[PDB]
Write a protein that binds this ligand. Structure first.
Ligand SMILES: Nc1nc2c(ncn2[C@H]2C[C@H](O)[C@@H](COP(=O)(O)OP(=O)(O)O)O2)c(=O)[nH]1
Length: 309
């Protein structure tokens, strides 16, 4: 896309600070691939939004470490990493302080995938900087987006939200998306499963515990998401007949316009390990030796990380 390339090069040519917002519950789904090569000369702040949804047991220091590590794997080395709740306000004041410090008197560009919370964050920034300057907000066209004065000589620029065609939220509608997203702090639900058992996180993803005897699994998902538990040999049959009805989301219409569910295998060899379904939630495995087969639509990310508790 010619449009997005032009702005990336423009931002790269400037000495501006880049603020990249990601959804902490959809880290890989909301990642902007390639951004790192265009803003290599620029200082970047990586901002993880929706911190209010993080369970109390999860440590923010470990979340930031995981964000920093994950960004590094994908070629981005941010100056620093921040956790915020644009909705509730947590971390906003500190981030505003950091933006002022790191920008070094230059402009700032805010970038993000759709639904990460960029509009909500931009609203927080307008408030944070409102009492600071005599210049007023202006709108400007992409070759109306907001330009927020930081002082009389520099501004913070909102940029058009990017559509990631492969993230989970791209395959669901408004009514459907409401069920998958947590409205409040995620409450960790403790499961005790035997070998050859299956968990369906609605009709969008599957978790197969294929080998390792009897174990405990802590699931972290939206309270509006329905988790269906079956025997492994019954899982295939249930999905072929009840997806779109019982195993919904997705709806029958969304099922037809969605990539086919693809499998991935994992073998955990260390204690406290999360199976992370981007855009959905995560399953914690306290003990090593578990053999797991995760199912996710073609394109959507599922990965492993060390627990953040
Ligand atoms: N729980 C939680 N939800 C949030 C937060 N910030 C934004 N949201 C919600 C509000 C919207 O329903 C949805 C998308 O927000 P938005 O600001 O319109 O995102 P964007 O498409 O402009 O990137 O996410 C936040 O900090 N916490």
């Amino acid at each position: 896309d010619d449009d997005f390339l032009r702005i990336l090069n423009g931002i790269g040519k400037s000495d501006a600070l880049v603020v990249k917002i990601v959804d902490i519950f959809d880290f890989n789904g909301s990642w902007l691939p390639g951004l790192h090569r265009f803003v290599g000369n620029n200082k970047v702040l990586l901002v993880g939004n929706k911190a209010d949804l993080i369970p109390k047991s999860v440590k923010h220091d470990k979340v930031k470490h995981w964000m920093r590590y994950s960004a590094k794997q994908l070629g981005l080395k941010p100056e620093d990493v921040f956790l915020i709740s644009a909705a509730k306000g947590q971390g906003i004041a500190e981030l505003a302080d950091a933006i002022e410090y790191y920008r070094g008197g230059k402009d700032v560009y805010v970038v993000g995938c759709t639904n990460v919370g960029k509009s909500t964050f931009i609203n927080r920034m307008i408030k944070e900087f409102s009492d600071e300057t005599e210049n007023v907000i202006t709108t400007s066209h992409f070759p109306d987006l907001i330009d927020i004065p930081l002082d009389e000589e520099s501004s913070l620029y909102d940029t058009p939200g990017i559509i990631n065609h492969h993230q989970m939220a791209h395959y669901v509608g408004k009514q459907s998306l409401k069920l998958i997203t947590p409205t409040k702090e995620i409450k960790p639900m403790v499961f005790q499963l035997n070998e050859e058992q299956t968990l369906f996180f609605s009709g969008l993803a599957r978790f197969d515990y294929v080998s390792g005897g009897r174990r405990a699994f802590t699931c972290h998902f939206s309270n509006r998401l329905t988790i269906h538990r079956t025997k492994l040999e019954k899982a295939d049959e249930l999905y072929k007949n009840h997806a779109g009805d019982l195993l919904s989301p997705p709806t029958p219409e969304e099922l037809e316009n969605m990539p086919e569910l693809v499998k991935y295998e994992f073998n955990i060899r260390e204690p406290k390990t999360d199976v992370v379904f981007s855009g959905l939630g995560w399953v914690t495995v306290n003990e090593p030796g578990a053999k797991i087969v995760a199912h996710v639509p073609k394109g959507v990310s599922v990965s492993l990380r060390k627990s953040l508790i």
